[PDB]
Design a protein around this ligand. Structure first.
Ligand SMILES: CCCCCC/C=C\CCCCCCCCCC(=O)O[C@H](COC(=O)CCCCCCCCCCCCCCC)CO[C@H]1O[C@H](CO)[C@@H](O)[C@H](O)[C@H]1O
Ligand SMILES: *[C@@H]1O[C@H](CO)[C@@H](O[C@@H]2O[C@H](CO)[C@@H](O)[C@H](O)[C@H]2NC(C)=O)[C@H](O)[C@H]1NC(C)=O
Ligand SMILES: *[C@@H]1O[C@H](CO)[C@@H](O)[C@H](O)[C@H]1NC(C)=O
Ligand SMILES: *[C@@H]1O[C@H](CO)[C@@H](O)[C@H](O)[C@H]1NC(C)=O
Lengths: 99, 263
């Protein structure tokens, strides 16, 4: 059966404006394994996104970690956008340093 | 004691397109990857060959190379002998005395295991699997090989991985924590973020003095890309009542000096 991806976005280090950091997008609980993941800066696709090898959990659902270098500022937004056969519309989750 | 898992994922889209990719884990550390694009299994640690000689490793790898081709052909012929797309997953390995496992899922549901000396369908598995499992069970060569892998090779290999990978397996990395908050009217959700720790066991609690706040809501463990962990723990609080709250973090890497951040 099809399972919808969960998406969590979080920084590697405490966010400090103007300091290089790494932004993580962890995508879990999906089936089938095929998936497209984009990371976005101010709504534009970020070109250098690295991704772990996909694997799966004990419940058989798949997961993968995407990550990118970023330098947070007061005004830049960042998001992770995922396309998966389980939903007609891509799903977007924004980084929110306060959450 | 650890758990060793070989995780195979195979996707068949039609008669003309399929792929098989595997990853291998010892505890939470990835030790191998085997991409569909690669003829050979890739080490993701310096110590991924464990204590196997080059000859023992090459023998074991050849076995898998033959298996990968045969598995793909066999599944495609099963489908022809009978609905695409098809997803098949295999989870095989051992835990510790040691006990081994080989579980198979079809379309994301557990349907078959190897147990003792034969393949079995699990109760509730679709009845069309019974005949092909029968025919698979008639292959004594395969049965015998699987028995040797599960009973002998898996724990042997794991013992060597544990020895060779000692410094990584027993590495300690320190958490760094930070606090933030969001509205949740008057109420706010406080967030204690904890990142970069290894190994996984950690204790994170909101506190008022020496009193643990049982509203502490711990999230899931989320991986960082550098083989450390991230966790956050939240606390709903009434307006003004934020004063006096602290997040306390205990971790093996800290040598008994907890992190305490004050709101
Ligand atoms: C990283 C190293 C660590 C080592 C630790 C070991 C840990 C685990 C062990 C993994 C064991 C994996 C099995 C490997 C076997 C190698 C031997 C071999 O060589 O295996 C192959 C292939 O077997 C299989 O196909 C295995 C099937 C397993 C999956 C069946 C589950 C049921 C499927 C349900 C879904 C159905 C979908 C249908 C859609 C309509 C045997 O087959 C070949 O080799 C034979 C010679 O022995 C030949 O006679 C035969 O003709 C040839 O085909
Ligand atoms: C691998 O280990 C299993 C035990 O987990 C052995 O399976 C047993 O086999 C005997 C005789 O072969 C049976 O009477 C038992 O019922 C089996 N146990 C189970 C749970 O089915 C197997 O023989 C071992 N194989 C090798 C080659 O060592
Ligand atoms: C088979 O699957 C692949 C991958 O999805 C696709 O490109 C191709 O169009 C499919 N159909 C046929 C008839 O090959
Ligand atoms: C996977 O590898 C097999 C073996 O080389 C190859 O035939 C097949 O085209 C590959 N599948 C994809 C999707 O690249």
């Amino acid at each position: 059966i099809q399972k919808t991806p969960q998406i969590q976005v979080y920084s590697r280090h405490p966010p400090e404006n103007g300091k290089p950091n790494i932004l993580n997008c962890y995508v879990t609980q999906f089936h089938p394994p095929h998936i497209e993941i984009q990371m976005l800066k101010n709504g534009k696709k970020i070109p250098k996104v690295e991704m772990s090898d996909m694997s799966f959990s004990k419940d058989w659902s798949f997961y993968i970690l995407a990550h990118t270098e970023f330098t947070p500022t007061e005004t830049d937004t960042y998001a992770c956008r995922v396309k998966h056969a389980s939903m007609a519309e891509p799903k977007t989750v924004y980084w929110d340093r306060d959450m | 004691n650890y758990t060793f898992r070989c995780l195979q994922m195979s996707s068949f889209a039609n008669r003309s397109w399929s792929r098989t990719d595997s990853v291998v884990w010892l505890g939470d550390l990835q030790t191998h990857r085997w991409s569909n694009d690669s003829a050979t299994i890739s080490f993701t640690k310096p110590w991924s060959q464990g204590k196997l000689s080059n000859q023992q490793w090459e023998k074991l790898q050849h076995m898998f190379q033959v298996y990968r081709v045969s598995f793909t052909r066999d599944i495609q012929e099963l489908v022809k002998m009978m609905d695409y797309p098809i997803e098949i997953q295999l989870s095989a390995g051992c835990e510790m005395a040691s006990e081994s496992f080989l579980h198979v899922a079809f379309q994301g549901k557990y349907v078959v295991r190897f147990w003792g000396t034969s393949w079995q369908t699990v109760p509730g598995a679709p009845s069309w699997l019974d005949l092909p499992i029968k025919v698979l069970n008639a292959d004594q060569g395969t049965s015998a090989t699987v028995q040797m892998l599960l009973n002998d090779t898996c724990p042997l290999f794991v013992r060597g991985l544990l020895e060779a990978g000692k410094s990584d397996l027993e590495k300690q990395e320190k958490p760094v924590a930070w606090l933030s908050s969001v509205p949740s009217h008057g109420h706010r959700q406080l967030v204690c973020h904890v990142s970069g720790f290894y190994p996984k066991p950690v204790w994170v609690m909101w506190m008022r003095g020496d009193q643990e706040q049982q509203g502490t809501h711990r999230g899931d463990f989320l991986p960082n890309a550098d083989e450390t962990w991230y966790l956050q723990a939240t606390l709903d609080v009434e307006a003004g009542e934020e004063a006096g709250l602290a997040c306390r973090v205990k971790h093996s890497s800290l040598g008994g000096q907890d992190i305490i951040l004050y709101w």
